[PDB]
Amino acid sequence: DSELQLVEQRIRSFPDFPTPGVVFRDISPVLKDPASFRAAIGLLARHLKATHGGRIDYIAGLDSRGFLFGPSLAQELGLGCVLIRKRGKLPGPTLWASYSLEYGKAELEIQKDALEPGQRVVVVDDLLATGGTMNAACELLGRLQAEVLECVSLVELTSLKGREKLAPVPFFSLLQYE
Amino acid sequence: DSELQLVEQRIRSFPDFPTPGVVFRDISPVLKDPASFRAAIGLLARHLKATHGGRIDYIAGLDSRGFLFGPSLAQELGLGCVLIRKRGKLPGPTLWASYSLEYGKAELEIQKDALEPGQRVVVVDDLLATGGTMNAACELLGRLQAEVLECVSLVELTSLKGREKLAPVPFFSLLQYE
Ligand SMILES: O=P(O)(O)OC[C@H]1O[C@H](OP(=O)(O)OP(=O)(O)O)[C@H](O)[C@@H]1O
Ligand SMILES: O=P(O)(O)OC[C@H]1O[C@H](OP(=O)(O)OP(=O)(O)O)[C@H](O)[C@@H]1O
Ligand SMILES: Nc1ncnc2[nH]cnc12
Ligand SMILES: Nc1ncnc2[nH]cnc12
Ligand SMILES: [Mg+2]
Numbered sequence: 001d002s003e004l005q006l007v008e009q010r011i012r013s014f015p016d017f018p019t020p021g022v023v024f025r026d027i028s029p030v031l032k033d034p035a036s037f038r039a040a041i042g043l044l045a046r047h048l049k050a051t052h053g054g055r056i057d058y059i060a061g062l063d064s065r066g067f068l069f070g071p072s073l074a075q076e077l078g079l080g081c082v083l084i085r086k087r088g089k090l091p092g093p094t095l096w097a098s099y100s101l102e103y104g105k106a107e108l109e110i111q112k113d114a115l116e117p118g119q120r121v122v123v124v125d126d127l128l129a130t131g132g133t134m135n136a137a138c139e140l141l142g143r144l145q146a147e148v149l150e151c152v153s154l155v156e157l158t159s160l161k162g163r164e165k166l167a168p169v170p171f172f173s174l175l176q177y178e
Numbered sequence: 179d180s181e182l183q184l185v186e187q188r189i190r191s192f193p194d195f196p197t198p199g200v201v202f203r204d205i206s207p208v209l210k211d212p213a214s215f216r217a218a219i220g221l222l223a224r225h226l227k228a229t230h231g232g233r234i235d236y237i238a239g240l241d242s243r244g245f246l247f248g249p250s251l252a253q254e255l256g257l258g259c260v261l262i263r264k265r266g267k268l269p270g271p272t273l274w275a276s277y278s279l280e281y282g283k284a285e286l287e288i289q290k291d292a293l294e295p296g297q298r299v300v301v302v303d304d305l306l307a308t309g310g311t312m313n314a315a316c317e318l319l320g321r322l323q324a325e326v327l328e329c330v331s332l333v334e335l336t337s338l339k340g341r342e343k344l345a346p347v348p349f350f351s352l353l354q355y356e
């Protein structure tokens with residue numbers, strides 16, 4: 001697939017960042033090449049319409065790199081984008097959810113009024129690894145009584161079993177690495 | 179039908195966040211209303227094309243809220259988007275710059291190969307306050323021998339004199355509050 005290859009060719013790999021033995025998958029060249037970025041958004045939007053038709057109310061973008069994709073995906077789909085942030089950044093009443101990031105704890109947060117009960121949401125981030133970030137986002141949304149239709153990413157690291165962590169919430173990635 | 183009123187009406191202002199006496203300008207409802215977001219990007223893109231014509235090579239989006247705008251703005255201008263991140267997030271060779279942020283010091287960073295010498299860039303962030311974040315971004319870009327044509331934001335807090343801190347780099351905001 002030509003559109004898929006536009007994206008795949010613009011992932012840059014950096015061994016041993018941030019820690020030895022790992023490979024960091026850098027999306028920066030995707031954002032830097034307008035045809036690549038457009039291709040990534042189009043592939044996501046196409047899959048989502050093919051899977052949910054008109055049922056998606058909102059995209060939820062995950063702080064920070066998910067913010068690079070959320071608004072553009074929402075726009076392509078004719079939808080608004082809600083924000084899920086790292087804790088301490090959002091004004092107004094909030095809820096938060098901890099997850100394991102690196103060697104300690106991080107927390108995501110959402111405004112209590114971000115969604116109404118029963119609203120249907122697709123979560124986007126750049127990359128699924130352990131699924132801790134995405135899972136925390138789903139927890140937040142469920143605690144607003146929102147329905148998470150699917151989570152999606154550009155990249156998925158399959159050996160980390162992020163997909164299983166999210167299950168039964170469906171998951172879709174453009175690209176898969178070990 | 180004022181496009182600018184579409185954006186203005188979707189700024190939510192929270193008193194005393196994060197500290198007493200401060201008014202937080204929350205862009206969240208802009209993102210959540212696809213017509214508001216579309217209007218915001220269109221206004222920015224129109225200003226930028228009217229001001230710089232074909233001179234812009236890239237948009238630079240500032241971590242984290244500037245990431246909400248950079249890619250869509252770049253897409254609208256048919257340009258790529260490069261990233262300026264909080265220090266510690268980017269792989270490979272980087273440059274970093276300190277700045278004063280609240281009561282302490284923060285650092286922004288950029289990959290050394292984000293831009294080549296002589297490339298021209300417009301920096302986008304959601305909000306200009308003291309100008310410290312934007313100013314650090316300009317310093318980083320200048321160190322890659324990139325030319326900063328302008329910096330732009332949705333919101334500008336004019337009593338903080340951010341515009342003066344950026345001078346002689348030009349600055350444009352959609353909306354102004356004391
Ligand atoms: O599946 P996980 O193991 O939770 O990792 C995936 C998350 O990690 C990265 O975010 P990070 O916490 O590095 O912050 P960033 O978005 O500022 O890069 C990435 O953008 C995902 O949000
Ligand atoms: O003009 P200044 O006084 O530097 O303030 C403006 C900056 O502050 C905010 O970011 P923040 O540092 O809160 O991080 P965020 O983008 O993750 O919210 C905002 O998005 C700008 O980047
Ligand atoms: N290898 C990786 N590259 C980029 N972001 C990540 N988040 C978790 N693992 C990552
Ligand atoms: N008043 C304010 N509202 C939102 N973001 C900000 N960043 C700096 N000052 C701010
Ligand atoms: Mg992230």
Ligand SMILES: [Mg+2]
Pocket residue numbers: 240241242243244303311
């Ligand atoms: Mg910011």
